[PDB]
Amino acid sequence: PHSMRYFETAVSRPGLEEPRYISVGYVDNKEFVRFDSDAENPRYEPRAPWMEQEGPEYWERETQKAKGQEQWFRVSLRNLLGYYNQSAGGSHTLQQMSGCDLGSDWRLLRGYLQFAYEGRDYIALNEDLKTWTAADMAAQITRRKWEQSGAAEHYKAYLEGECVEWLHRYLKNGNATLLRTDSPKAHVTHHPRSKGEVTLRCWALGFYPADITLTWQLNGEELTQDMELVETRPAGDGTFQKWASVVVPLGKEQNYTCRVYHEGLPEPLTLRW
Amino acid sequence: SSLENFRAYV
Amino acid sequence: MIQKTPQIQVYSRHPPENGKPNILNCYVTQFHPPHIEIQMLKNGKKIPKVEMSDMSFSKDWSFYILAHTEFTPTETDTYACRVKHDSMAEPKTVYWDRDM
């Protein structure tokens, strides 16, 4: 389940030559590095404690590569403008996600490489790291252009090599941080809703990693389609929050139970109002 | 370690 | 033209207790283009020294960002997050509901 990813974003700035470029790296969904074109002094920066292990040459090297990406995204955005017959007067976006996943056996599980224009799928490298999948006609142009040039082999090499190399290293250096858990602190609240009905909220707070499952049950059945589940949100200190509520008849609250499943919980919790 | 895109642009 | 309206959640880092210092969060997600303006309010007034996290985007390409500021929830003060984004003809103001 381990993984590493770099989410890159280039936003064109009408009238200007250089687009804004932002690169964020992640290991097991935790931001660990970031480069922002706007900074007073553009440079990849540490975003996780365990990254303080890297010497000055590391940041120097990563920063140079970023400069290279800036140019690539700059030219690509210009090309895309042409593909879609768009005007340069407006702002446009080109995004890229790339990285690798490790299975339970530790070998490489899969490599990834996908691009999006204006926030929509554009083109993606298939799992075989040899063929491309284009989302539309414009992308078809890119696809045919890249097959003829053999870009796939370039990406495949990085994805099966350097990507795996550094992921193992990072997982090794930040082991104590990345492999930790903070089981959720949960509780149920009771709120007025409408006549003869009340709301019961099951809260899960300060947990890590973000993965979690909250369920409600009524007489042995999970209330799948009658439960409001909010989207997981960051507490701001590295941990997350989430809750699921149900509307129940006033007087029958005791018939409902909430279960919390998290990897920091050897046994699922079971609460009720 | 970040990737450096292939010489071919979109 | 490819626009996505932001989803907005306003909540406190720690359980709300009137009188006790806390941190108010305004989590804005699922929007595009990346350009977005966020302001946090206390009784309709912009709260000074509001901190913005750096922006990022999720697996589905949509962007997200977290704005946060110190606040002390009370009985009568109201808190809200006002978001201005190209996908909306007008700024959207979402109030903090301590039960959410």
Side-chain angles (χ1 to χ4, degrees), chain A residues 1-39 41-273, chain B, chain C:
Chain A
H2 297 298
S3 66
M4 176 162 83
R5 293 273 192 298
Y6 275 86
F7 285 50
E8 300 173 69
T9 297
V11 182
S12 70
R13 305 192 124 151
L16 307 193
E17 188 58 38
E18 294 291 344
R20 181 176 183 181
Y21 170 77
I22 295 175
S23 174
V24 190
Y26 302 81
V27 173
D28 287 2
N29 303 313
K30 176 67 177 63
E31 181 176 324
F32 75 115
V33 293
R34 174 179 295 259
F35 172 103
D36 190 326
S37 198
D38 267 21
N41 204 281
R43 177 154 259 132
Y44 258 100
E45 277 181 353
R47 308 288 296 188
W50 46 272
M51 279 308 277
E52 290 307 11
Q53 280 275 290
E54 302 309 319
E57 64 291 329
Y58 171 93
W59 307 103
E60 175 55 41
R61 182 170 58 260
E62 289 304 293
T63 297
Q64 272 190 181
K65 298 197 292 191
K67 305 287 209 175
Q69 296 295 75
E70 289 186 298
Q71 322 319 316
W72 194 97
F73 279 80
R74 177 177 52 77
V75 179
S76 290
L77 267 132
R78 181 207 296 152
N79 292 350
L80 288 159
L81 212 71
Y83 292 174
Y84 294 93
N85 181 202
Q86 286 168 146
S87 163
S91 183
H92 303 280
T93 75
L94 180 52
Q95 290 164 285
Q96 173 179 168
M97 288 189 282
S98 64
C100 54
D101 288 354
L102 308 189
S104 243
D105 85 320
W106 282 53
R107 301 182 181 176
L108 169 65
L109 221 192
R110 186 193 194 295
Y112 296 74
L113 175 60
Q114 46 202 306
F115 301 81
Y117 182 53
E118 316 286 50
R120 293 179 302 187
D121 294 325
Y122 183 75
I123 195 173
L125 192 56
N126 288 144
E127 180 165 353
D128 56 21
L129 280 31
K130 309 156 197 166
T131 136
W132 303 92
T133 297
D136 59 17
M137 295 216 269
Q140 286 282 289
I141 301 174
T142 299
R143 210 246 301 146
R144 288 161 184 150
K145 181 183 174 182
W146 288 4
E147 303 175 336
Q148 183 238 66
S149 60
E153 292 96 286
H154 173 82
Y155 294 111
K156 171 181 163 65
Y158 165 83
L159 295 177
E160 302 186 316
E162 180 175 356
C163 196
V164 173
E165 182 199 329
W166 291 86
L167 176 47
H168 276 76
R169 180 184 169 76
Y170 299 141
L171 286 168
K172 201 165 298 167
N173 295 334
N175 189 287
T177 301
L178 285 306
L179 307 188
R180 280 196 67 262
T181 69
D182 282 302
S183 79
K185 291 165 181 175
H187 74 294
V188 179
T189 47
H190 190 272
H191 313 286
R193 195 275 201 152
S194 62
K195 189 177 64 184
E197 304 190 77
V198 302
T199 295
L200 301 180
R201 280 243 153 56
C202 196
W203 307 76
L205 303 166
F207 63 81
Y208 177 82
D211 309 295
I212 193 168
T213 297
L214 311 175
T215 61
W216 275 99
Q217 277 181 41
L218 174 58
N219 299 36
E221 306 291 342
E222 314 203 321
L223 307 178
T224 310
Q225 302 158 293
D226 303 297
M227 183 192 298
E228 180 176 20
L229 189 73
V230 277
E231 22 294 302
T232 306
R233 65 197 187 198
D237 56 11
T239 62
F240 305 78
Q241 307 176 351
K242 189 178 192 74
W243 61 248
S245 49
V246 286
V247 184
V248 307
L250 172 59
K252 298 187 172 303
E253 299 94 302
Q254 249 81 69
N255 294 169
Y256 301 78
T257 58
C258 171
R259 283 183 163 61
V260 180
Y261 306 77
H262 183 80
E263 55 173 35
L265 257 31
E267 298 304 317
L269 295 175
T270 295
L271 323 73
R272 58 152 57 84
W273 169 237
Chain B
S1 184
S2 63
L3 165 99
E4 283 194 273
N5 291 179
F6 184 62
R7 81 182 187 59
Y9 309 110
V10 169
Chain C
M1 278 301 261
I2 317 313
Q3 304 181 162
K4 275 187 124 180
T5 305
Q7 293 191 0
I8 304 161
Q9 277 196 267
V10 180
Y11 53 105
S12 62
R13 180 179 291 182
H14 313 104
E17 290 192 62
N18 289 163
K20 302 184 179 297
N22 208 317
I23 297 179
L24 180 59
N25 288 313
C26 178
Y27 190 48
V28 188
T29 63
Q30 299 292 308
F31 64 84
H32 181 94
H35 185 70
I36 196 170
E37 299 174 58
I38 302 166
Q39 306 159 308
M40 298 193 277
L41 315 167
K42 177 181 182 180
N43 301 322
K45 178 183 184 179
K46 295 178 66 295
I47 303 175
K49 307 194 68 178
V50 150
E51 295 186 298
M52 295 283 148
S53 77
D54 296 299
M55 193 178 281
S56 314
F57 74 78
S58 66
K59 254 90 176 185
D60 72 0
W61 305 116
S62 72
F63 299 81
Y64 63 92
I65 187 167
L66 176 66
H68 56 86
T69 189
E70 283 170 343
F71 87 123
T72 298
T74 66
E75 221 173 29
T76 65
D77 302 310
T78 70
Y79 296 84
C81 190
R82 182 178 53 235
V83 181
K84 174 181 171 181
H85 186 256
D86 240 24
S87 61
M88 304 181 290
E90 74 296 29
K92 184 182 181 176
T93 293
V94 175
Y95 292 81
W96 172 56
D97 180 335
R98 66 180 70 203
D99 298 332
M100 308 283 286

